[PDB]
């Protein structure tokens, strides 16, 4: 009992203007994500517990 529509993109053909706009937006998002991911990886890799012995347990 609901109205179903099309994706308007899975049926549309790729366009040069759409491709350019998507490339620009993706480049900006990729820059931001690269910076954020570098910071996150620096945080995660440095927040690891030290190496243990062969069979040390607490």
């Amino acid at each position: 009992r609901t109205k179903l529509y099309n994706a308007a993109y899975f049926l549309l053909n790729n366009n040069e203007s759409f491709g350019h706009s998507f490339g620009i937006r993706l480049k900006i998002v990729g820059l931001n994500t690269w910076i954020v991911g570098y910071a996150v990886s620096r945080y995660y890799f440095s927040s690891l517990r030290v190496k243990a012995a062969q069979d040390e347990r607490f």
Binding site: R1, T2, K3, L4, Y5, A7, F10
Partner: protein, 198 residues
């Protein structure tokens, strides 16, 4: 001696007068802005004595002043400023109620659209649940009653029909007219349907 009282009276009077002078434009902008997030364009474009004016109105309606130092005209102006602050606070409360109704309508519309999005692979239900239909019916009845209550103000009624009714039209277009759909859309599909060309 009465330095504290003098300073309090002077500051309160100055703030009340400043907020009352700059209140008509603020109220007009509040009417201009849509109901959803009615404080829009203030925190973004220009907060021209909106938050300061609300705080000052609340203080004035919740505090007292000493008219002994103020003259007759000063006391009249302070009382007028307090009355203007009270009227602005009432308008703000009415706008908050309208914003709450519009936000409920928008939440209902977003719930309807959420199960129809192409990215909604978590749950895709063709027929709406009875809870959603009953909530929509109650909201339609409330919208009809509120619009009827706005008969005394044609401009306010038109603004309400334009703002709140847009979400109603969006929800109606998102639901097929089968089964109990006419039972749900009996209230809306009398005059307000044709306003959105439906």
């Amino acid at each position: 001696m009465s330095l504290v009282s003098l300073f309090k009276n002077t500051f309160l009077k100055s703030r009340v007068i400043g907020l009352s002078f700059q209140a008509q434009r603020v109220m007009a902008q509040m009417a201009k802005t849509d109901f959803e997030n009615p404080d829009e364009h203030f925190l973004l474009n220009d907060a021209m004595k909106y938050n300061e004016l609300v705080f000052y109105g609340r203080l004035a309606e919740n505090w007292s002043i000493n008219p002994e130092l103020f003259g007759k005209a000063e006391l009249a102006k302070y009382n007028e400023a307090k009355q203007t602050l009270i009227d602005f606070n009432q308008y703000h409360a009415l706008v908050q109620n309208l914003h709450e109704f519009y936000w409920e309508l928008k939440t209902i519309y977003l719930e309807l659209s959420r199960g129809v999005a192409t990215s909604n692979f978590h749950n895709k239900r063709e027929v709406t649940h009875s809870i959603i239909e009953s909530d929509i019916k109650n909201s339609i009845h409330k919208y009809i009653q509120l619009i009827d209550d706005l008969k005394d103000y044609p401009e306010w009624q038109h603004k309400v029909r334009e703002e709140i009714g847009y979400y109603a039209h969006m929800i109606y277009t998102s639901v097929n007219h089968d089964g109990n759909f006419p039972e749900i859309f009996k209230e809306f599909n009398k005059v307000d349907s044709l306003y959105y060309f439906k």
